[PDB]
């Protein structure tokens, strides 16, 4: 299902045009709302007093058709940044007139060009409109990958086109966009309609638009090549770009006249559809994670909170994770009990944070696989989950499993443990307070005992997403700090973003923690080399864990365990976006902090410019001990 539009600047009979466009397969029609040559005076007589009607009637279509099928277009003569004062003033009046008429019709979106550098007054007038009436039309800023000036034929004898690479210069249309949306205060209603030229620029120019709110991709008829049977297709380079845009679920707009004159108009659409069918289908992670793309959620705190039945059901749905846990205990049981000792030596296993018992069942399956005897304790502090365990224990497990309705840091254990097995790790490894929990459980691990996991290590990477920056910004609430939303992590399936440097490890914790003078507080400095011009909006956080020896789990994208989907990446935003030039180092500083009651993260960017320290003293975000 490619959602598809037709761009026209010529609409003689509105109903007939729309009807032809509907028969062609298009879901909507971009068109002007006043006639695009009908230039209008507002100041000077006699033309200011021109008899109306000033445009077509709203009665020509249904309200439903205006709301679903029609995208308005700003008239191309409207130049609010003209060097001529009178064009400036008439264009101001005319812009507000056209916008207000689109709002009167209830149009779902309205198109405006960015076709020069200075759109400052166009932004001002759009902002004026935005704060006038209560409506919710989208504003699609029509901006090209490559400026007309920079794709022109090399045919002016005395003004040759530059044959030198200009790295920043070739990205100029991003700066047109950036400056526009910055001026308009990052309104959710202002999106990009990215216009694709016949010749794509360098990859870095395209990459520049990663993490931008691209709602439309405009495809001119001129950019389509012709295949041996006469029909429209695209180059493999353009196809690459289309597959990326499809992943952003943009609406594709076809603009310009039919040059492929042998075939039906359907053809252009049929190619996009052809391309849409022939992508690689969604992998079982991407199938599981559909809907959650860039949806911010609170990180779960299974310590502070008692997790719901269905949350445990979700945790349990990851058979890769448990076959790994099973394998880690399997390999461990063999390493601890030799073959000749197998009937003498019953290993005391303790599931610390047993939930509804998947690790308990993995421990049973592993022991029968290993052919070694085990004594199970299932320690769980959530008394709701303990109901599930105790029903499981009576019906199935029996006396082999002892259920313990207790905190692992309080529990006075009847004996010491050969192996402690746990599953206390969030998306940043230590953000559910596994260090503190296993530290207080450590006194009943045997002197030679194993923790599964033995180790885990968080990873961070700087990102750009103006989309995700907006999502965070929209989480302002009543009755708290108006910036608290920027000073807290979010679990999010990051999707429309740009990873700006390779992830690096942040914090590591090892279990057992044999170190005499224990401290789980941390301070880390990371220097991230950046090869692009960009804007930093936060740090994606991942993790890795050693269950036992080579048996590992990871959500670090480059080493991601195949098939594992229990965790999404975490996101640490910053309050103010940071301009990062090509070749600069992003320096981030992260702290893990604590008192008796709370654990929290603080963070700051120190290069190429200083941010404020975020979440100082846990003022916006704490993790309950």
């Amino acid at each position: 299902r490619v959602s598809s539009g037709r761009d026209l600047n010529c609409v003689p009979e509105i109903a007939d045009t729309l009807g032809a466009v509907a028969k062609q397969g298009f879901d909507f029609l971009c068109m002007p709302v006043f006639h695009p040559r009908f230039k209008r005076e507002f100041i000077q007589e006699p033309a200011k007093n021109r008899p109306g009607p000033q445009t077509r009637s709203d009665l020509l279509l249904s309200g439903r058709d205006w709301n679903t099928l029609i995208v308005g277009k700003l008239s191309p003569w409207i130049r609010p940044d003209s060097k001529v004062e009178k064009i400036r003033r008439n264009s101001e009046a005319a812009m507000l007139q056209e916008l207000n008429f689109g709002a009167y019709l209830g149009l779902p979106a309205f198109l405006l060009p960015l076709n020069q550098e200075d759109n400052t007054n166009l932004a001002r007038v759009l902002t004026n409109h935005i704060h006038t009436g209560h409506h919710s039309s989208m504003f699609w800023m029509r901006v090209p990958l490559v400026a007309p000036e920079d794709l022109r034929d090399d045919i002016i004898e005395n003004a040759p086109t530059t044959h030198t690479e200009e790295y920043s210069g070739e990205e100029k249309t991003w700066m047109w966009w950036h400056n526009f949306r910055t001026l308009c205060d990052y309104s959710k209603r202002i999106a990009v309609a990215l216009e694709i030229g016949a010749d794509l620029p360098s990859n870095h120019v395209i990459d520049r638009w990663l993490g931008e709110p691209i709602k439309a991709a405009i495809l001119p008829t001129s950019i389509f090549l012709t295949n041996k049977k006469g029909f429209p297709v695209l180059s493999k380079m353009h196809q690459r770009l289309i597959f990326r845009l499809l992943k952003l679920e943009v609406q594709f707009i076809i603009t310009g006249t039919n040059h492929h004159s042998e075939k039906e108009f359907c053809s252009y659409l049929q190619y996009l559809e052809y391309l849409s069918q022939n992508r690689p289908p969604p992998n079982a992670y991407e199938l599981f994670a559909k809907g959650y793309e860039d949806y911010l959620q609170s990180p779960l705190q299974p310590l502070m909170d008692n997790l719901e039945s269905q949350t445990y059901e979700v945790f349990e749905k990851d058979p890769i994770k448990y076959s790994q846990y099973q394998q880690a205990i399997y390999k461990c049981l063999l390493d601890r009990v030799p073959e000749e000792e197998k009937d003498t030596n019953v290993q005391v296993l303790m599931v610390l944070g047993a939930g509804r018992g998947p690790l308990v069942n993995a421990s049973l399956r592993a022991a029968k696989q290993a052919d070694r005897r085990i004594k199970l304790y299932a320690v769980e502090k959530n008394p709701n989950a303990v109901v599930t365990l105790e029903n499981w224990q009576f019906e199935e497990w029996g006396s082999q499993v002892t259920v313990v309705s207790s905190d692992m840091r309080e529990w006075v254990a009847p004996e010491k443990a050969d192996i402690i097995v746990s599953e206390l790790l969030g998306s940043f490894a230590d953000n559910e307070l596994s260090p503190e929990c296993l530290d207080g459980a450590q006194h009943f691990l045997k002197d030679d005992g194993v923790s599964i996991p033995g180790e885990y290590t968080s990873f961070l990477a700087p990102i750009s997403s103006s989309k995700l920056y907006n999502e965070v910004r929209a989480c302002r609430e009543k009755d708290r700090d108006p910036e608290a939303q920027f000073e807290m992590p979010y679990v999010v399936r990051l999707h429309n973003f740009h990873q700006l440097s390779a992830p690096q490890p942040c914090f590591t914790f090892s279990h057992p923690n044999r170190d005499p003078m224990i401290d789980n507080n941390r301070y880390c400095t990371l220097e991230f080399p950046v090869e692009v011009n960009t804007v930093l909006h936060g740090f994606a956080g991942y993790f890795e864990t050693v269950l036992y020896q080579d048996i590992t789990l990871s959500i670090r994208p480059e080493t991601h365990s195949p098939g594992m989907f229990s965790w999404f990446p975490i996101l640490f935003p910053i309050k103010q976006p940071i301009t990062v030039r090509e070749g600069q180092t992003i320096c981030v500083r992260f702290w893990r902090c604590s008192n008796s009651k709370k654990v929290w993260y603080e963070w700051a960017v120190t290069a190429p410019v200083c941010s404020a320290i975020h979440n100082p003293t846990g003022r916006s975000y704490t993790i309950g001990l």
């Binding site: 600047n9 010529c10 609409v11 003689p12 009979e13 509105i14 006043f34 006639h35 695009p36 040559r37 009908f38 230039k39 005076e41 000077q44 006699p46 033309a47 007093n49 021109r50 109306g52 009607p53 000033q54 445009t55 077509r56 009637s57 020509l60 191309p76 003209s82 060097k83 001529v84 009178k86 064009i87 076709n115 400026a147 007309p148 000036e149 794709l151 022109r152 034929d153 090399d154 045919i155 002016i156 004898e157 005395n158 003004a159 001119p220 008829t221 001129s222 603009t255 310009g256 006249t257 039919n258 040059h259």
Partner: protein
């Protein structure tokens, strides 16, 4: 006949060609009209011929005596021809080759070829006989506001644009365009001097330019200069039109001789009678055909 009169051009025998758009209301179409009696214009029922086009008329021009070359909103450059009797107007071709509104059209000196400019940024050279684009030029960086064919040289023409370039073209060169302040809106070649042209800007200045070496200029209008039309005299006068809703006729040195505030909407075309060189006809979006008696 639709309200917004866009074009007005005389042929050799003093018959008036009108082009019109409906730029508002329900139907946004256009039309082409021949008046053998000029003083009857705009009146529809007392005219020689008339026809409905599918879309509006941004610009047109005569192709000698019987052909009508039309710049459409559709993207089509259209050739309509008069029949054997000159009472009907039949489409000979309508070729959808520009990707936006065709704004400006101009027939080249020989009359077998023409040049068209569009909002799509391109300038296209046409073979009127073969009905195809010979050459397609993306020299500009914005809308092509005006193209103007050289009177006597088939390979030469002027174009101007919203990128603030006036380009002198010469198809004989490997790099045909050559670049020659506020944006240029209208272009007119000097009829007697191959090396000279005038250009009107969006701020109401008319400027006089030699190809060798904005030299002489006058603030003629208060708003944009839409059109510039040299007279048929040996010592020609320059008619200048504007969005200020005024006609001015100018001398060699751009001094104000005649001035008409007769039009109440924008003045869109001008055309000097070849029967009487002192009569000048304008048309405007007020649906007026005003016949001015120029004190020559």
């Amino acid at each position: 006949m639709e309200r917004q009169l866009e074009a007005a051009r005389y042929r050799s025998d003093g018959a008036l060609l009108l082009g019109a758009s409906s730029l508002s209301g329900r139907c946004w179409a256009g039309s082409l009209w021949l008046f053998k009696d000029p003083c009857a214009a705009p009146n529809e029922g007392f005219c020689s011929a008339g026809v409905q086009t599918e879309a509006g008329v941004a610009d047109l021009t005569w192709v000698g005596e019987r052909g009508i070359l039309v710049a459409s909103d559709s993207g089509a450059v259209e050739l309509w021809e008069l029949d054997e009797n000159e009472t009907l107007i039949v489409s000979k071709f309508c070729k959808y080759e520009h990707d936006d509104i065709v704004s400006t059209v101009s027939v080249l000196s020989s009359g077998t070829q023409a040049v068209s400019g569009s909002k799509d940024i391109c300038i296209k050279v046409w073979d009127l006989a073969q009905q195809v684009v010979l050459s397609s030029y993306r020299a500009h960086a914005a809308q092509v506001t005006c193209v103007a064919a050289s009177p006597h040289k088939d390979s030469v023409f002027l174009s101007c644009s919203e990128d603030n370039r006036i380009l002198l073209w010469d198809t004989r060169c490997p790099k045909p365009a050559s670049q020659i302040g506020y944006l240029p809106t209208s272009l007119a070649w000097h009829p007697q001097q191959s090396e000279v042209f005038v250009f009107g800007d969006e701020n109401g200045t008319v400027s006089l330019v030699d190809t060798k070496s904005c030299v002489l200029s006058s603030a003629v209008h208060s708003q944009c200069v839409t059109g510039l039309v040299f007279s048929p005299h040996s010592v020609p006068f320059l008619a200048s039109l504007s969005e200020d809703c005024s006609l001015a006729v100018l001398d060699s040195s751009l001094s104000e001789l005649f001035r008409s505030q007769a039009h109440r909407d924008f003045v869109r075309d001008a055309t000097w009678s070849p029967l009487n060189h002192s009569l000048l006809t304008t048309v405007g979006w007020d649906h007026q055909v005003v016949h001015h008696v120029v004190p020559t």
